[PDB]
């Protein structure tokens, strides 16, 4: 069992520290198994060996863990990364001076799967943000430059790595504890920088929202940065996609522009509508409509404490659309524009599939009726799409 090894490393550490290189070699050898019990045993062997021994053996431990991480096999990578995470949360001060070795992993970012990169950035960030480091905070201000030089790159893969790292570091930097200080302003500056950098490419733009809206949900963050990001995201989404309903007509398209799938048929009493058709026609930005709304909703619900009364007209809003029903223009005119119609139906169905996810927790009866009608609309669209 493990309390046996606990007693072993607690009582006889002074004699056992003589041959710690052999201990580390044995742990490295037995970590290469397939089951989970042996791997966990070797993991805790590394942990306890780092806990009690001399600083040189600690350097040897972190070197062995680094070469384990850069080895390549998935189970070894996950196990070693988890070991490093629990080791740095256990004894941050001893691990602090050995940050060079763990940072040196960042040169090898082709042997690591995309999911483990987030964990690596997480463990490095929580290493570099303990208040014992505030005496000489060098790792933090080095990583704020590493992220910048990653984002300003031209290779797409490093740009994606940069956005992942920037989001997962800003999350720890603005972490909610038991602040509202200049660190929040730095968090805001980092976020607007990484928004300006990755605003152009849409495939690289969707990842930013799909990481930020996960971080702002599973973890939490302090009310000040929350307030600022909520204000700017609400302003930006209100300015960007929202087109007033009373000015619905606009020309220059081969298809007759119309508004469909509204609720209660108010017929443009006030200005709420989704301008989906012109954006797609110009893209013969709208590709990132699906996650931007999710980020907006989750941010506003966290800012107002589960109160969605602000985004209320964004359930009965209609969508600018052509005559999506097949008017016998399917057998004929089966040109490239047919694929455009397919993508349009796909994207509006995805928007409906997100908007039904948005308002379900609320318990107002007629509002529940609204979301059920939205469900009927998405099922009829999913029927139509096969044509």
């Amino acid at each position: 069992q493990e309390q046996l090894l606990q007693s072993t490393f607690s009582v006889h550490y002074l004699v056992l520290k003589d041959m710690c290189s052999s201990i580390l070699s044995l742990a490295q050898s037995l970590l290469h198994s397939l089951d989970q019990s042996i791997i966990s045993f070797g993991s805790l062997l590394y942990k306890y060996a780092f806990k009690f021994f001399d600083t040189y053996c600690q350097q040897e431990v972190v070197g062995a863990l680094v070469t384990h991480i850069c080895s390549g096999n998935e189970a070894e990578v996950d196990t070693a990364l988890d070991v490093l995470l629990e080791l740095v949360v256990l004894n941050p001060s001893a691990m602090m001076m050995n940050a060079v070795f763990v940072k040196g992993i960042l040169d090898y970012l082709d042997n690591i799967s995309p999911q483990q990169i987030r964990k690596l950035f997480y463990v490095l960030s929580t290493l570099a943000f303990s208040k014992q480091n505030e005496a000489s905070s060098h790792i933090q201000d080095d990583m704020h430059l590493v992220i910048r030089k990653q984002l300003s790159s031209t290779v797409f893969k490093y740009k994606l790595i940069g956005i992942i790292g920037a989001v997962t570091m800003a999350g720890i930097m603005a972490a909610d504890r038991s602040l509202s200080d200049e660190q929040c302003t730095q968090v805001t500056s980092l976020l607007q920088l990484v928004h300006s950098c990755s605003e152009q490419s849409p495939q690289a733009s969707a990842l930013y929202y799909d990481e930020f809206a996960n971080l702002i949900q599973h973890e939490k963050l302090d009310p000040k940065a929350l307030e600022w990001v909520g204000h700017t995201i609400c302003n930006d989404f209100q300015d960007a996609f929202v087109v007033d309903s009373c000015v619905v007509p606009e020309g220059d398209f081969p298809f007759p522009v119309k508004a469909l799938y509204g609720l209660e048929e108010y017929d443009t009493q006030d200005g709420i509508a989704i301008n989906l058709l012109p954006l797609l026609f110009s893209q013969d930005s709208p590709l990132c409509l699906a996650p931007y709304f999710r980020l907006l909703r989750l941010c506003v619900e966290r800012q107002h404490n589960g109160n969605l009364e602000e985004i209320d007209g964004l359930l009965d809003c209609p969508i600018f659309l052509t005559d999506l029903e097949p008017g016998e223009k399917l057998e004929s005119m089966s040109a490239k524009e047919r694929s455009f119609m397919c993508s349009l139906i796909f994207l509006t169905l995805n928007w409906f599939r997100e908007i039904v996810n948005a308002f379900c927790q609320e318990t107002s009866p007629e509002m529940k009726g609204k979301v059920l009608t939205r469900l009927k609309h998405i099922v009829e669209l999913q029927i139509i799409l096969e044509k």
């Binding site: 490295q28 050898s29 290469h32 850069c70 082709d110 042997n111």
Partner: protein, 311 residues
């Protein structure tokens, strides 16, 4: 024949299928002879760092086959009168480029274990396993510096040399079988030549070599305390020859060889230790060489001499 170094940029970012990369690596194999000897290691580095996301068996197989063929040709046409004679690239260049390339391949294998597993499964042996060569033996001996592959390559080498000595003992025992086939270089002389060739200032194979010698000696020692004894005796003789050969050439390792032999021979277990004793007597023939490097292990061996029994 000049832009081939930048010909690799086409396979970096765009995805490909197996047929076209196999065709281009076949072209590369065909032009290995054309380009130059000295330009090879950077090209090997480029192709092998490309190979992680694509073809992995083909490049390693081509490099191994090319260098085995080149070593074979150089060895066959090197023999002759010590005078003016036709020869290709000299030994001092060939051994150096081989050392750089084997070190690069070991590094690349250390970057991803899948290449090493493919290499090990590729050279699997009963069978002749004709792909074995001084270059490939050196490769397998240098991969042992990684903990993942140590036993997995040493057991393969051990079974290979046992199969070779069994083949020799079977072939010498008949006329008909000796009448039909022409002799092939049996792997005993292959390793016995690799150890001699290892003088050319590369030491990353000495540890694998001494470990192989000790494993191969221990596993087939005379345990008498009849047909299978002859391979089991030739194997021990080969192990002693290998150990004594690496003792003289390389300096950094000679302190540990004698320590292991002593630590294995000074026992009260009364196990048969005739071969270890013979090896120790052979390697203390060069008395000053021992005194330069390791004159301490013999001293504490002497201090323990009071406790052992009479024989």
């Amino acid at each position: 024949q000049q832009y081939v170094i930048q010909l690799t940029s086409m396979f970096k970012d765009v995805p490909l299928t197996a047929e076209e990369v196999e065709f281009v690596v076949e072209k590369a194999l065909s032009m290995f002879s054309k380009m130059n000897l000295q330009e090879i290691p950077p090209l090997v580095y480029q192709l092998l760092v490309l190979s992680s996301k694509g073809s992995r068996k083909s490049v390693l197989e081509g490099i191994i086959a090319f260098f085995s063929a080149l070593d074979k040709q150089h060895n066959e046409e090197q023999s002759g009168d010590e005078l003016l004679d036709v020869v290709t690239v000299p030994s001092g260049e060939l051994r150096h480029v081989e050392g750089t390339i084997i070190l690069h391949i070991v590094f690349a294998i250390k970057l991803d274990y899948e290449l090493g597993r493919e290499l090990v499964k590729h050279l699997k042996v009963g069978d002749s396993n004709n792909n074995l060569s001084p270059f490939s033996i050196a490769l397998l001996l240098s991969v042992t510096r990684i903990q993942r592959f140590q036993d997995q390559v040493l057991d393969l080498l051990k079974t290979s040399v046992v199969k070779s000595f069994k083949d020799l003992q079977l072939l010498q025992g008949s006329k008909f079988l000796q009448n039909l086939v022409p002799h092939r270089s049996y792997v005993s002389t292959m390793i016995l030549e690799v150890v001699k060739n290892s003088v050319h200032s590369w030491d990353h194979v000495t540890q694998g070599l001494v470990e192989l010698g000790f494993i191969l000696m221990d596993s087939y020692g005379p345990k008498k305390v009849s047909l299978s004894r002859m391979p089991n005796q030739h194997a021990c003789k080969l192990g002693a020859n290998i150990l004594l050969e690496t003792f003289k050439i390389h300096e950094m390792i000679r302190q540990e060889i004698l320590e292991q032999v002593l630590n294995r021979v000074v026992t009260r277990a009364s196990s048969p230790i005739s071969h270890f004793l013979d090896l120790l007597s052979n390697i203390v023939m060069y008395a000053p060489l021992v005194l330069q490097s390791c004159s301490s292990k013999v001293t504490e061996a002497f201090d323990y001499l009071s406790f052992l029994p009479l024989q």
